[PDB]
Enzyme design. Sequence first.
Site, mmCIF file in Angstrom:
data_model
loop_
_atom_site.group_PDB
_atom_site.id
_atom_site.type_symbol
_atom_site.label_atom_id
_atom_site.label_comp_id
_atom_site.label_asym_id
_atom_site.label_seq_id
_atom_site.Cartn_x
_atom_site.Cartn_y
_atom_site.Cartn_z
ATOM 1 N N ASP B 346 44.316 45.640 38.227
ATOM 2 C CA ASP B 346 44.012 44.881 39.427
ATOM 3 C C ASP B 346 43.233 45.785 40.371
ATOM 4 O O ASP B 346 43.228 47.010 40.221
ATOM 5 C CB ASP B 346 45.286 44.347 40.089
ATOM 6 N N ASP B 687 52.588 43.291 39.710
ATOM 7 C CA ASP B 687 53.402 43.385 40.915
ATOM 8 C C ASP B 687 54.471 42.302 41.052
ATOM 9 O O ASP B 687 55.515 42.545 41.665
ATOM 10 C CB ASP B 687 52.501 43.337 42.151
ATOM 11 N N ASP B 691 53.380 38.049 36.294
ATOM 12 C CA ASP B 691 53.030 39.080 35.338
ATOM 13 C C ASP B 691 54.162 39.364 34.363
ATOM 14 O O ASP B 691 53.954 40.112 33.401
ATOM 15 C CB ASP B 691 52.649 40.367 36.075
HETATM 16 N N1 LIG Z 1 48.694 37.955 52.857
HETATM 17 C C1 LIG Z 1 47.540 37.298 52.734
HETATM 18 N N2 LIG Z 1 47.244 36.342 53.642
HETATM 19 C C2 LIG Z 1 46.093 35.676 53.518
HETATM 20 N N3 LIG Z 1 45.143 35.813 52.590
HETATM 21 C C3 LIG Z 1 45.465 36.764 51.707
HETATM 22 C C4 LIG Z 1 46.614 37.536 51.704
HETATM 23 N N4 LIG Z 1 46.610 38.421 50.637
HETATM 24 C C5 LIG Z 1 45.476 38.168 50.031
HETATM 25 N N5 LIG Z 1 44.732 37.180 50.624
HETATM 26 C C6 LIG Z 1 43.441 36.659 50.190
HETATM 27 O O1 LIG Z 1 43.650 35.837 49.055
HETATM 28 C C7 LIG Z 1 43.138 36.484 47.866
HETATM 29 C C8 LIG Z 1 44.151 36.358 46.751
HETATM 30 O O2 LIG Z 1 45.041 37.494 46.747
HETATM 31 P P1 LIG Z 1 45.671 38.040 45.405
HETATM 32 O O3 LIG Z 1 47.026 38.662 45.747
HETATM 33 O O4 LIG Z 1 45.744 37.014 44.344
HETATM 34 O O5 LIG Z 1 44.699 39.238 45.011
HETATM 35 P P2 LIG Z 1 44.151 40.556 45.714
HETATM 36 O O6 LIG Z 1 45.009 40.778 46.960
HETATM 37 O O7 LIG Z 1 42.700 40.503 45.974
HETATM 38 O O8 LIG Z 1 44.534 41.714 44.680
HETATM 39 P P3 LIG Z 1 44.403 42.070 43.124
HETATM 40 O O9 LIG Z 1 43.234 42.966 42.893
HETATM 41 O O10 LIG Z 1 45.744 42.720 42.767
HETATM 42 O O11 LIG Z 1 44.290 40.715 42.423
HETATM 43 C C9 LIG Z 1 42.787 37.907 48.292
HETATM 44 O O12 LIG Z 1 41.694 38.430 47.545
HETATM 45 C C10 LIG Z 1 42.434 37.726 49.768
HETATM 46 O O13 LIG Z 1 41.116 37.215 49.931
#
Ligand SMILES: Nc1ncnc2c1ncn2[C@@H]1O[C@H](COP(=O)(O)OP(=O)(O)OP(=O)(O)O)[C@@H](O)[C@H]1O
EC number: 7.2.2.13
Lengths: 294, 993
Positions: B346, B687, B691
């Site tokens: 990730d 995480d 998964d």
């Molecule tokens: N706590 C949050 N509140 C609002 N939007 C969020 C939050 N966390 C993430 N996002 C948005 O939504 C998307 C989805 O998050 P997701 O956890 O699926 O992946 P990520 O945080 O980009 O990490 P990874 O690389 O582990 O997938 C993020 O890329 C971000 O744009």
Amino acid sequence: GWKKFLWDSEKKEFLGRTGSSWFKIFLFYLIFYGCLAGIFIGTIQVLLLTLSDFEPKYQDRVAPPGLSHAPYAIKTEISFSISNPKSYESFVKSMHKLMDLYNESSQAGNSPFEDCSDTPADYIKRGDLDDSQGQKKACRFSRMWLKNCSGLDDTTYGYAEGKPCVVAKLNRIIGFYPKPLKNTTDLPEELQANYNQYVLPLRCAAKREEDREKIGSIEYFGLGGYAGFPLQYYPYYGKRLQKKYLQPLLAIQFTNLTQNMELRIECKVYGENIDYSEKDRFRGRFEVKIEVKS
Amino acid sequence: DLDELKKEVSMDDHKLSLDELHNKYGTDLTRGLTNARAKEILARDGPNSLTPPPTTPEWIKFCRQLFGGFSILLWIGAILCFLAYGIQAATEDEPANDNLYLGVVLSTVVIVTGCFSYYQEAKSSRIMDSFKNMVPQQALVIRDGEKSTINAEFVVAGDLVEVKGGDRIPADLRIISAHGCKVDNSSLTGESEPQTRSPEFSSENPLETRNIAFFSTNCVEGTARGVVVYTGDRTVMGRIATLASGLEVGRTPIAIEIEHFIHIITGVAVFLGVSFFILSLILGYSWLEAVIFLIGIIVANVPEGLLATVTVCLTLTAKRMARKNCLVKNLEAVETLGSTSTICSDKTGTLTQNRMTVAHMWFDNQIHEADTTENQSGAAFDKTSATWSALSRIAALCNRAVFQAGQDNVPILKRSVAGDASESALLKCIELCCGSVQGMRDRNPKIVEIPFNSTNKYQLSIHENEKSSESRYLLVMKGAPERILDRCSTILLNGAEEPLKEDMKEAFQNAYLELGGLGERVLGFCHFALPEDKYNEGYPFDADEPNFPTTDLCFVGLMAMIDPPRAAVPDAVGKCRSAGIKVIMVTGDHPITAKAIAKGVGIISEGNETIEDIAARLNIPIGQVNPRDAKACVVHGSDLKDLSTEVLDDILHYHTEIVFARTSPQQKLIIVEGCQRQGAIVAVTGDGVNDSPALKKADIGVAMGISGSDVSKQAADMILLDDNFASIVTGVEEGRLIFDNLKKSIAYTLTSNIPEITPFLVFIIGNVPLPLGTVTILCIDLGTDMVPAISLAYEQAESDIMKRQPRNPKTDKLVNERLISMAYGQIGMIQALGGFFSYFVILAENGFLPMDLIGKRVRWDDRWISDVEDSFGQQWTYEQRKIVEFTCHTSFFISIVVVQWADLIICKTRRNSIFQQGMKNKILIFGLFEETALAAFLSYCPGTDVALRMYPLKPSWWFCAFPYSLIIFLYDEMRRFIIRRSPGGWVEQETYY
Ligand SMILES: Nc1ncnc2c1ncn2[C@@H]1O[C@H](COP(=O)(O)OP(=O)(O)OP(=O)(O)O)[C@@H](O)[C@H]1O
Ligand SMILES: *[C@@H]1O[C@H](CO)[C@@H](O[C@@H]2O[C@H](CO)[C@@H](O[C@@H]3O[C@H](CO[C@H]4O[C@H](CO)[C@@H](O)[C@H](O)[C@@H]4O)[C@@H](O)[C@H](O[C@H]4O[C@H](CO)[C@@H](O)[C@H](O)[C@@H]4O[C@@H]4O[C@H](CO)[C@@H](O)[C@H](O)[C@H]4NC(C)=O)[C@@H]3O)[C@H](O)[C@H]2NC(C)=O)[C@H](O)[C@H]1NC(C)=O
Ligand SMILES: *[C@@H]1O[C@H](CO[C@@H]2O[C@@H](C)[C@@H](O)[C@@H](O)[C@@H]2O)[C@@H](O[C@@H]2O[C@H](CO)[C@@H](O[C@@H]3O[C@H](CO[C@H]4O[C@H](CO)[C@@H](O)[C@H](O)[C@@H]4O)[C@@H](O)[C@H](O[C@H]4O[C@H](CO)[C@@H](O)[C@H](O)[C@@H]4O)[C@@H]3O)[C@H](O)[C@H]2NC(C)=O)[C@H](O)[C@H]1NC(C)=O
Ligand SMILES: *[C@@H]1O[C@H](CO[C@@H]2O[C@@H](C)[C@@H](O)[C@@H](O)[C@@H]2O)[C@@H](O[C@@H]2O[C@H](CO)[C@@H](O[C@@H]3O[C@H](CO)[C@@H](O)[C@H](O[C@H]4O[C@H](CO)[C@@H](O)[C@H](O)[C@@H]4O)[C@@H]3O)[C@H](O)[C@H]2NC(C)=O)[C@H](O)[C@H]1NC(C)=O
Ligand SMILES: *[C@@H]1O[C@H](CO)[C@@H](O[C@@H]2O[C@H](CO)[C@@H](O)[C@H](O)[C@H]2NC(C)=O)[C@H](O)[C@H]1NC(C)=O
Ligand SMILES: CC(C)CCC[C@@H](C)[C@H]1CC[C@H]2[C@@H]3CC=C4C[C@@H](O)CC[C@]4(C)[C@H]3CC[C@]12C
Ligand SMILES: CC(C)CCC[C@@H](C)[C@H]1CC[C@H]2[C@@H]3CC=C4C[C@@H](O)CC[C@]4(C)[C@H]3CC[C@]12C
Ligand SMILES: CC(C)CCC[C@@H](C)[C@H]1CC[C@H]2[C@@H]3CC=C4C[C@@H](O)CC[C@]4(C)[C@H]3CC[C@]12C
Ligand SMILES: [K+]
Ligand SMILES: [K+]
Ligand SMILES: [K+]
């Protein structure tokens, strides 16, 4: 698998390799093992060089001489029937093998035998342990000296009528001088009478206090009529410097032996350079289990 | 456990009524069951827990460990010892008790090895059971008309059970009344689709209807009531778990490797044994002699100390990993990392630092930059338009994070914020150029909020309007720029509103691609004024039905944020590419950004190109270019939702740099299952619970530690404590390092087997006095060789390990024929020759020349021949010659140690020279010193002739093995030289382990 890893016909492989791989490996191992063998042989030849032919470098593991006998007992036991003749054959055969080396025909001429005192005498030094003088000379030991156990009169040596004999012998040691106990106030009871300094005494007895009564008359035969070894037959110069050498012997007749009962008889030699061991039951003394069952 | 009745398709009683089901279970729809009746059923049917199936009892597995390869051989050794004792006791009087002692000792060795291995596996099991660290839970049952939370195991069939969004369905239920309840049937449907549970019936298939809740699922949102129709092993997840658990796990690679050599060792052991036993009786040997032979040969062939050495080695490397931030749960996972060739990681929290700051903002068709510097020393962004004010209200309101109490002293950027990193970055930017957010938030009371949903991909809420002249309601929502773009029809330009014609839609696409290309994460913010005529100030908008217009909103502008990368990330990617590990960026981030982060981390090497890049460079349509000219590719989540299996196989089979964006961590599992199918070891980084099915089926599951949840970490095989990506590389390196050392130690231990086997063989072929007893052997394999073999693990690398490709399991092994050719074929031969040398020397010095030793055995062993003539004519009693033979055993053992010195030095390095690597391993030096001190102690200590039968040696003997040792050193030194000069030659394909 099973068939392929054994013989395939496309790559012309056997067991896994071709004829050139098997050949390279076989040739390598042949050269390697050849070098290994040559090196081991060289290191063994240098070993043939580093030692002397007339004397053992280390003589500490054979300091206290042993006390062996003529009969070959499996468990130091002599059991035989006075009726069945095929019972004491294993004994007579051995006895005979031992006495067969003292035949007069073997001891003849001036070389290399020499006539020695018919009565016990002192040591005799034929020089050092060298090759300067030729083959040294050893004293003659006649069979007849042993009176009733000689196989010359009663081939069986006694076993025929309940009166077996036991020819004792002192282990041959190079440069070993036998030394007897002196006449001082401290000496065993037995040894007092007939203190011929020149004779190493040998005396048998019973292991337990009870068996005493059941053991009859221990009649010893030897050089001069004494129960020991004459000091004149020492020292021994070794095979290389004294081939055709005869060691003294002492015969022991166990007359008047109780019938049908296991008797434990312990024979023991006495002397200064003689010491016994609680682990080795043949160092200086010896044990025999006679049982004339009839 | 009838499998056919479990293989059949599930049946049910769904097509019924509410009256027809209570009668079947004796319950009340408004009062539930009674406590007495509940307990009567709890005792009638049993607990609501997976009934213990074929489990391993304490004594069963302990007794299992007592029977396994080396223990069977040692068992037959003990049996043989007692047989020889019985024979002696019945054949001879005063039978020494040496054999009975040796047998009791062998049995003790077998019992203790067990105990040790079992203790280690128990230690791992305890540390494994200590992972649930926060708090358990229970179910909500209604009995006698009252609500109570009781142990889930105490739930029975018939009582009333209530569920709430966030709780797990405790058993199979029959919904009776629901309020917008939704469930996540990921365990049965395989899809993260939020199915709604309604009291009415809708499909003939029980898995498709909504009036049934199923164990192993969770209520995502809403509350519901229901009767318990199934509990315990009878639930759906019960039939899944009890019959699918029976399925065996497997046998890890290191286990298969330990089996392969036990097979070879046993082969040569039986070959030598059955053959010499038949030979012994072909030469006239009695039974009490042949038994002693058989025993000596079995002990000589078996390396009584190896397996325990391996177990220790592995424990040492596990402690080193626990020290380098990488914790391993299962001992064998240590090696699985090295053999890995595919990683599914990730981007947030591994490649990046996860600390995060807002960077760019979109509004009034113009990109604006914000100050992203610690001390705030830069340029402002023109805070004079109304658009910015509306943006500040959207971000400051639609955000649930708040500064941690007591930070009134630290600066606006370094203070602690309880919440996610995106809401924290937004809160900090608003608190930075818009004043106190706490008053901005109390200045507009939030009426109803719908938090971010992994499915909705948006956060919305309707707060009151501070407008003193406009008593209306405000609605704000943030989310993915595409989804929010699909939910609007007006644009707040310089304050006024305008339509969403394609001109600004394209300007929004180019702006989105601009912020994405910058490696930043963009979010969209929009709002709308609810008409107070259709939704008065008194109407309550409960979050249940469509009370707010999802579309026709007013988009105000995009907001990016700079989560930066980590120090070793570019280096880690380079290391992975150098080794040959296919990295796959799986991130919930945007492809528009993913292509930038990809170019910035290495995934997209400087030079590779995608089909769209080629179409843009040649200004031609994309349907014309051939997909073979594109090395990398960006796969969208939606296109992943609509993709077949074979297509995925080809996608992974034809591309070297794949990046998955707009991906829901569910699809992840699909990609993992597609990566294993082609034939490569797979690792994964997770995480949460989505998964869980991916980490379990992956060869190695890497779970995060700080941000990870109990479920994800407890279900994985390796846990990270710093959440960094460099730790994965460190784990792989240590997995390789501990492999080359095992090879060296194995060759070491094996080499000394020849000098122990040859004396016996010459004893039978040449008829010479026994050169090496059995007690001396056990004193060699269990004594002087243990410490050096253990030290061989502390050896550092020789070349670069993180550069070579992963080892092939079907061709490269741990113990091949090259090692056999070295230990059994060359070094061991020299050691045996040295031992025989010292032997002949000891006998020649005491009077027994080599010419008179051949043929003496029959009389040398005869216990009743007190007159054995030597080469000089002396008469030796039985005990005197035996004392000399024992002294020859002592010198043989010391010769073994002397040659082991050079063997441990030539085994230290496999290719490199000693003058290069260096003797920096203090453990090896200590091993040599101790190995010598032990031999001297065993020979010179008084009373060793009563216990071990070892007599003192004369100072001139100790030097009989020195030339052989130096020769071994020179031979191996020149050996490890042609390999360096001639790569690929004969010495390499013949002696390079
Ligand atoms: N706590 C949050 N509140 C609002 N939007 C969020 C939050 N966390 C993430 N996002 C948005 O939504 C998307 C989805 O998050 P997701 O956890 O699926 O992946 P990520 O945080 O980009 O990490 P990874 O690389 O582990 O997938 C993020 O890329 C971000 O744009
Ligand atoms: C140790 O080993 C010896 C053998 O080396 C062994 O036995 C001795 O063997 C010889 C010969 O076998 C004995 O010598 C002579 O034995 C004569 C026996 O032969 C007569 O009888 C047979 C049949 O019975 C006839 O065929 C034959 O023709 C003879 O008639 C014996 O006659 C010899 O002379 C003795 O007897 C005459 C009288 O008859 C006497 O005048 C002699 O002086 C002589 O001595 C006396 O013997 C008797 C016998 O008991 C005795 O009682 C008397 O006191 C003697 N008088 C003395 C001493 O003044 C002649 O003996 C020889 O005797 C055998 N034994 C001994 C002890 O010498 C031994 O048995 C072995 N010993 C042990 C302990 O193992
Ligand atoms: C050392 O001396 C040994 C004895 O010497 C004898 O006595 C000395 C004092 C001198 O007088 C000497 O000249 C004597 O020979 C000597 O051993 C002897 O060797 C001969 C020759 O083989 C043996 O003669 C044979 O006897 C057997 C039967 O033996 C029975 O008795 C003995 C015990 O004495 C038992 O062991 C046996 O099992 C028997 O129970 C005869 O069957 C055999 O017949 C052969 O000769 C006849 C003619 O006489 C032919 O017709 C046949 O075809 C055969 O060819 C012999 O008569 C004598 O038994 C044996 N004595 C002993 C005690 O064993 C020994 O060899 C000398 N060693 C050295 C190295 O000098
Ligand atoms: C080894 O040793 C013994 C014993 O020696 C004596 O004891 C020693 C421990 C030490 O104190 C010696 O000084 C001491 O003499 C030697 O044998 C002894 O010899 C004497 C002398 O013949 C014997 O004494 C005799 O005893 C008889 C009664 O038992 C008695 O009738 C004898 O009379 C003789 O002497 C008197 C004078 O006293 C004379 O008038 C007589 O006419 C007659 O000659 C005599 O007193 C001992 O009994 C002997 N001891 C034993 C145990 O028999 C032995 O000779 C010696 N061997 C060698 C090679 O030196
Ligand atoms: C040999 O032993 C026997 C006993 O077995 C002795 O003879 C016995 O002597 C007692 C008197 O003390 C008599 O009562 C027995 O009748 C005798 N038995 C036999 C068989 O004669 C004999 O004195 C011993 N002889 C020697 C020389 O020791
Ligand atoms: C460097 C290595 C491979 C060289 C090893 C050389 C070997 C093969 C040489 C060294 C010493 C040699 C032996 C030494 C002693 C003797 C005794 C002599 O009366 C005949 C030759 C003979 C039997 C030699 C045979 C060959 C031999 C063993
Ligand atoms: C006591 C003496 C005479 C026995 C000597 C046995 C020797 C010659 C045996 C023992 C071990 C054997 C080797 C052990 C291992 C291998 C590797 C295999 O892939 C091919 C055979 C090969 C190369 C063997 C060749 C013959 C060999 C060296
Ligand atoms: C470089 C190589 C070829 C040199 C090998 C030297 C060999 C031949 C040397 C090294 C050590 C030596 C032996 C070491 C120990 C002893 C014991 C001593 O009480 C007598 C000499 C004797 C028996 C030596 C004989 C020769 C020997 C084996
Ligand atoms: K062994
Ligand atoms: K797994
Ligand atoms: K070994």
